[PDB]
Design an enzyme around this catalytic site. Structure first.
Site, PDB file in Angstrom:
ATOM      1  N   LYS A   1      71.159  14.275  30.165  1.00 60.47           N
ATOM      2  CA  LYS A   1      71.119  13.407  31.335  1.00 60.47           C
ATOM      3  C   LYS A   1      69.709  12.891  31.561  1.00 60.47           C
ATOM      4  O   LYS A   1      68.731  13.633  31.429  1.00 60.47           O
ATOM      5  CB  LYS A   1      71.615  14.154  32.585  1.00 60.47           C
TER       6      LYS A   1
ATOM      7  N   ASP B   1      74.251  18.834  48.021  1.00 54.90           N
ATOM      8  CA  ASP B   1      74.862  17.646  47.416  1.00 54.90           C
ATOM      9  C   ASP B   1      75.323  17.852  45.973  1.00 54.90           C
ATOM     10  O   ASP B   1      75.473  16.882  45.218  1.00 54.90           O
ATOM     11  CB  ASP B   1      73.945  16.417  47.545  1.00 54.90           C
TER      12      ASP B   1
END
Lengths: 312, 312
Positions: free
Chosen positions: B105, B233
């Site tokens: 990523k 989150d």
């Protein structure tokens, strides 16, 4: 132990691995003679035991030297192994690969500029003679940086055998000026004798007329090539392997010990000779720069050939 | 093809080879969490076909990530092979190793600062739980530079199987705020469904009570650890492998597909689940920075655990 040595090994390892991935064409392009590869490494709080923390490694004209190694019959994996599996040993400074196949010499940035100047004509000469020459076989050229110190190295094929030990060793220039080893020198373990030691001590080289004629033909073309590039002050290095003395404490692979010449059958002693031109990177001008702090490249050429002509 | 991708592969290859020479002790020192390795390469008129001519590669905390990979049961030679033998495939951006074992990523320099901030406490948590956790398994973190573009990447273990395909996929946060996939989203090939799609479509996960209890115990410790670092989150990623549908066009190695949980024997369909926490690197403050252009880390923690508690 020596950090500059560790960088070289690391650098050669890196350089060969990189090239193992490149498609090698049959030819070199003009750009290849101007090319280089630079690596700068910075390790912060890491890998302190193996490598210096900050170093640079530069490889000059990697494709040209890859091309030269193959022309000189040297496989890249073997070159890599010879230079990296264990440290080179010391003995300007020079080092020998642990397996005695390659010499690593430390040279000046001036020498590097001169090597760049002749590299293309050297390469074309190597092509023209199919790699059959008494000239140094230049296999790689690098710049090493370890914190404050910058050094340049050139790698060549050992003139001497990797198996067969040399007991006597001469460096011949054939100069009118009196060349002789020092009396301090004459007492070193494996001394480096010179022109007087040869004329004086009646040294003979026992090689048959076919080997002699072939050798001197090679020599002639090589020295003419060198004269042409205005290079001078090179030597014939001559090493002698005594088969008898080696048995006390004798065949060789001519594909590894490429400079070897067997003695003829009537030789007083079973001898193998290793002869080659060395130390070619002095341009006429650069010799004058070391003299400041009568014979030219053309003269030197003739002087040299006469002398070697006489001694065999 | 993608030069940033080629640098990463080159860089990972380099990094693992370097480490293969380092003596690995059982422990990490405080300095290891501040360490890095930088390489800058400059090729002039050389090697144009394989690599960009000018690039930099930086590896953060190489010893810590070497330590983590082994703790997560990952051999360095295999990691290297997975990332270098063939290019990773695309699908911020993410890439998957050609063999589907690892995710790469692209993250921000802010994310990198946060990863550095928690790396030591992450490591200690991984030690404490013997590597048995639903948290991302962080395997390496790098900075790539190719002429003008700088990117940062983190490598993790794939949540999903490297063999067994996933046909349905959920991203759950358990938020009071209405999370639902978009209608444009719901029409992607392998869509990423969210909390509403789960409550609404009556999705069931058929796992036995022993697997369920173990899972939720792991989850509880992990989320508490995250709350403690003021992180929020993050999601539970849930993937479902349909054994029947896979036979139309089902056992797994729990030592490779470490997040897999078999369905119980009374499941309406032969299913394998892959569940893990993902996307942990949003610190409370960093979320506010993306919102400017009511619930905190502690709240988020409870909300998250209640929801997952309910859905299994």
């Amino acid at each position: 132990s020596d950090p500059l040595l560790s960088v070289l090994m690391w650098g050669v390892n890196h350089s060969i691995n990189e090239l193992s991935h490149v498609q090698i064409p049959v030819m070199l392009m003009p750009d290849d003679f101007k090319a280089y590869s630079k690596i700068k490494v910075d390790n912060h709080l890491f890998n302190k035991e193996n490598m210096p923390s900050h170093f640079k490694f530069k490889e000059y004209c990697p494709m040209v030297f890859r091309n030269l190694r193959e022309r000189f019959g040297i496989d890249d994996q073997d070159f890599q192994n010879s230079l990296t599996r264990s440290a080179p040993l010391p003995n300007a400074r020079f080092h020998t690969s642990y397996d005695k196949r390659y010499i690593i010499k430390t040279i000046t940035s001036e020498d590097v500029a001169e090597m760049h100047n002749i590299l293309k004509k050297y390469h074309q000469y190597i092509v023209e003679c199919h790699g059959i020459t008494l000239l140094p076989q230049f296999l790689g050229m690098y710049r090493l940086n370890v914190d404050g110190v910058e050094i340049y190295v050139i790698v060549t094929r050992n003139v001497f055998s990797h198996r067969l030990s040399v007991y006597r060793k001469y460096d011949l220039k054939g100069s009118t000026v009196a060349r002789e080893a020092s009396d301090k020198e004459k007492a070193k373990e494996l001394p480096t004798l010179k022109d007087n030691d040869f004329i004086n001590e009646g040294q003979k080289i026992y090689i048959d007329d076919n080997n002699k004629k072939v050798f001197l033909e090679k020599l002639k073309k090589d020295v003419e090539f060198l004269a042409q590039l205005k290079l001078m002050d090179y030597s014939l290095l001559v090493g002698i392997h005594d088969v008898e003395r080696a048995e006390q404490e004798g065949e060789f692979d001519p594909n590894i010990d490429v400079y070897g010449i067997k003695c003829h059958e009537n030789s007083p002693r079973k001898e193998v000779y290793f002869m080659a031109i060395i130390d070619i990177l002095t341009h006429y001008d650069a010799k004058k720069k070391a003299a400041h702090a009568t014979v030219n490249p053309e003269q030197y050429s003739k002087r040299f050939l006469d002398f070697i002509g006489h001694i065999l």
